[PDB]
Design a protein around this ligand. Structure first.
Ligand SMILES: Cc1cc(C)nc(Sc2c(F)c(F)c(S(N)(=O)=O)c(F)c2F)n1
Ligand SMILES: Cc1cc(C)nc(Sc2c(F)c(F)c(S(N)(=O)=O)c(F)c2F)n1
Ligand code: NA
Ligand SMILES: [Zn+2]
Length: 257
């Protein structure tokens, strides 16, 4: 079905998922000149001290690290958020080349990759229920640029050969996602959507200003994953990003400057 190829990529999605042409689609270009400092935003509270990772999965589109979300452990709050959002998983989007791969752009700049830490609003009880609500999810987006290796990423990079193909999973316990954060928690925020089908308009996006640095070797390893299942023709999992979508009426707010 949907994917990122010429035949089933982002410009095709609207035929199965009409909200693809909706009023709050993601990602977007972040025009840093037009974003407004909002002195009423609070600092983000990223509380990942008790995160419990469980598993890593190649889902055929990306790979995702999944967390135990059956209690309040790893939570995002503050900033533009009302209430408490629980971390359920993180995943990445990346390019076939270092000069593309991110979903959001900054003044049209593309980064090599983008990390998404997905959280759901605990007022809706479960992730699945939250995926249906306008303020159901909060996704923390972090850009990756190629430079110095990110030591906190290497445990993820090293397990990818065990999940090469669609539907493969591996145990992945005791991974600390604090090691994927940049120094600064300065951010942009705007209301948007899932960037993959079903493209539901349920996401408060929080995009950090500071990218993390990863090495060329780290991102090359992402590019060795496969979209296909085992035993099927090999198609490299690369360019699994949706381009920027129309901003429409929306305002992007800055936590800083
Ligand atoms: C490239 C390809 C491979 C296969 C196996 N089926 C298809 S048919 C198809 C499909 F199943 C889809 F789900 C989609 S979509 N709107 O992108 O979700 C599509 F465009 C399609 F063209 N296309
Ligand atoms: C709707 C749904 C349900 C489930 C269980 N996983 C997913 S995986 C996923 C995904 F692939 C994504 F790309 C995103 S994203 N880019 O953060 O909007 C997401 F939130 C996701 F949760 N999506
Ligand atoms: Na659940
Ligand atoms: Zn994503």
């Amino acid at each position: 079905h949907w994917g990122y190829g010429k035949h089933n990529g982002p410009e095709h999605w609207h035929k199965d998922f009409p909200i693809a042409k909706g009023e709050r689609q993601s990602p977007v270009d972040i025009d840093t000149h037009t974003a407004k400092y909002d002195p009423s935003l609070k600092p983000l509270s990223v509380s990942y001290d008790q995160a419990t990772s469980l598993r890593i999965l190649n889902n055929g589109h990306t790979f995702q690290v999944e967390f135990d979300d059956s209690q309040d452990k790893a939570v995002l709050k503050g900033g533009p958020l009302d209430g408490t959002y629980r971390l359920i998983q993180f995943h990445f989007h990346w390019g076939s080349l270092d000069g593309q791969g991110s979903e959001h752009t900054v003044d049209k700049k593309k980064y090599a990759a983008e990390l998404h830490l997905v959280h759901w609003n605990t007022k809706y009880g479960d992730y699945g229920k939250a995926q249906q609500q306008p303020d159901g999810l909060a996704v923390l987006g972090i850009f990756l640029k190629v430079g110095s290796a990110k030591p906190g990423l290497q445990k993820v990079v090293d397990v990818l050969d065990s999940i090469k193909t669609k539907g493969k999973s591996a145990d992945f316990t005791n991974f600390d996602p604090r090691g994927l954060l940049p120094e600064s928690l300065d951010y942009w925020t705007y209301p948007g959507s899932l960037t993959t089908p079903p493209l539901t308009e349920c996401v408060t996006w929080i995009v950090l200003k500071e990218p993390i640095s990863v090495s060329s070797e780290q991102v090359l390893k992402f590019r060795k994953l496969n979209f296909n299942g085992e035993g099927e023709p090999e198609e490299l999992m690369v360019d699994n990003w949706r381009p920027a979508q129309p901003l429409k009426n929306r305002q992007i707010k800055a936590s800083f400057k």
